[PDB]
Design a protein around this ligand. Structure first.
Ligand code: MG
Ligand code: MG
Ligand code: MG
Ligand code: NA
Ligand code: NA
Ligand code: NA
Ligand code: NA
Lengths: 322, 315
């Protein structure tokens, strides 16, 4: 019915479990007091590569084929330079194949050094989409590589879903999961899994109000991507939802909570100071959502809430600027 | 025979466990690989109040009408905060002595302490606390020499030994040595084949000197170190225990401490305070490399996470 099924998620689980961490679930009496709920934090910031994206990336490397005629990926290629590019490079390393990241001439010098440092080869294009698409198709062809989309690729969605298998096992009494949404690969993967195993558990998304395409798409009942590049501190959720995650989100996510930039910053600082977890601000989005005024509308029966702390890849010095 | 025995630690554990977190033991692929050992981090930065000191503080408040109508102490950092919280749990006001930075003053108020102001001298802080203690019918809890504190800090080891059945060594940062002493009593009673090591800054190496010289040699002058929770010297009540039960003392430099803290932040995503990076620094150190390879499973106490994030820019 959708681009993935719970069977794909469990295959992904079997595919990646030997190489990822089963991250712990931590609690905070302080955050319980502030919210009135019993919170559980799924600590994907402690995952390999610093975010949950190693799950989708490794599943993609282990299950996609480059060609009808070649069953084995000989390289991986992607347009993402942040958490997805870092996770994919590491997945390719584990598999003994080369990683390529297609990089605009125009992206910052910091970006270029980062990619090289986590072990990918960089291939340069013009800033344009016609150039990005062209050089990538080129690299993919010369290397017999696979492109791995950060959020719309079925194998990636299915790998991110494995977060929910662990959550449901680790938190048997959970009433809801709260997931930051960008392109919606993780949300969609988790929604598929939760609704297949225990559909009375709510799946809520948390979204910056400055990048609120997933909220607007669910409100309008059709896919409404951001018309302009969003500006938010929550850098991992600037992507819009897409054609493969939208139908899942439409049908299987219970609600979307939006949070302001100040809410994201306050929640992030609260987790740093009160939990001592160095989350990236994008991972503060879900905490913000549960602290938010609108979350009070959620029923008191929804008591046990697991928040995915999705990543910890933050430049600590950069934080002075807020 | 020492100021505490295991029996005191077991009493502590019963005394406090309903009010403290049984904190997790976490591991890091990256650090194992840098050290060539199997590392276990006991995460007391996630303890109530941000440090392990709630254990001793709570054990003191609940052990020492009988029952206190307040608390007061000289220590304003982690110990003060722990005692304050312990006060709150007992439903009694907490008082800390404050000379008459305003940044620190605003801070003390933030954790619910009531400020009793004094003149900024030696005889005035003391006598102001004295005499505060008297008037409020409250109690005096030393940060590291008080037997109920030391026994309370020993409960870390009861937890580690359960959580890490195969453990071969514990690594513990040392200031006044209440934590090191409690742990040593506990470890040597329960599982004496397990090694107990101290980690100490160079700029504050009284404990190391004391071991080497076979006698108690406190710091001559109040030390300068980023590891602000370990500036205290070893004392008459913890020394004998450390002399006899602690296997070795590893010294680390300021730079080792900073590097170790930064590595934990960035690779483990745990906001440890620099004092807690002392024990990591120790296990990364050249001197640590020497340790017999039979000692594989190592538990490092991450003793606290109370660091001012802003002030990180300084270093
Ligand atoms: Mg329920
Ligand atoms: Mg969005
Ligand atoms: Mg010392
Ligand atoms: Na299904
Ligand atoms: Na937008
Ligand atoms: Na990202
Ligand atoms: Na589709």
């Amino acid at each position: 019915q959708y681009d993935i099924s719970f069977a794909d998620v469990e295959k992904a689980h079997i595919n990646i479990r030997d190489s990822i961490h089963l991250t712990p679930v931590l609690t905070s009496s302080i955050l319980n007091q502030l919210t009135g709920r019993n919170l559980f934090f799924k600590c994907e910031l402690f995952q390999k590569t610093g975010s949950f994206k190693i799950r989708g990336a490794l599943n993609a490397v282990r299950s996609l084929v480059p060609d009808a005629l070649e069953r084995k990926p000989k390289a991986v290629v992607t347009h993402s330079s942040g958490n997805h590019g870092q996770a994919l490079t590491y997945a390719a390393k584990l598999e003994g194949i080369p990683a390529y990241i297609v990089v605009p001439q125009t992206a910052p010098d910091c970006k270029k050094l980062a990619i090289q440092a986590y072990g990918a080869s960089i291939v340069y294009c013009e800033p344009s989409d016609e150039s990005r698409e062209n050089v990538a198709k080129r690299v993919t062809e010369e290397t017999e590589g696979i492109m791995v989309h950060p959020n719309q690729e079925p194998a990636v969605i299915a790998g991110q879903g494995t977060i929910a298998l662990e959550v449901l096992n680790q938190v048997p009494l959970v009433d809801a999961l709260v997931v930051p949404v960008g392109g919606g690969g993780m949300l969609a993967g988790i929604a598929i899994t939760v609704k297949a195993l225990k559909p009375s558990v709510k799946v809520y998304a948390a979204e910056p109000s400055n990048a609120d395409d997933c909220y607007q798409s669910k409100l309008k009942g059709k896919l409404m991507p951001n018309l302009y590049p969003p500006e938010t501190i929550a850098d991992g959720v600037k992507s819009s939802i897409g054609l493969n995650t939208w139908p899942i989100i439409r049908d299987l996510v219970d609600d979307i909570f939006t949070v302001t930039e100040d809410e994201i910053k306050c929640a992030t600082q609260l987790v740093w100071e009160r939990m001592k977890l160095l989350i990236e601000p994008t991972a503060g989005v879900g905490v913000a959502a549960v602290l938010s005024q609108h979350f009070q509308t959620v029923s008191p029966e929804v008591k046990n809430i697991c928040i995915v702390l999705s990543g910890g890849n933050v430049d600590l010095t950069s934080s002075i600027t807020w």
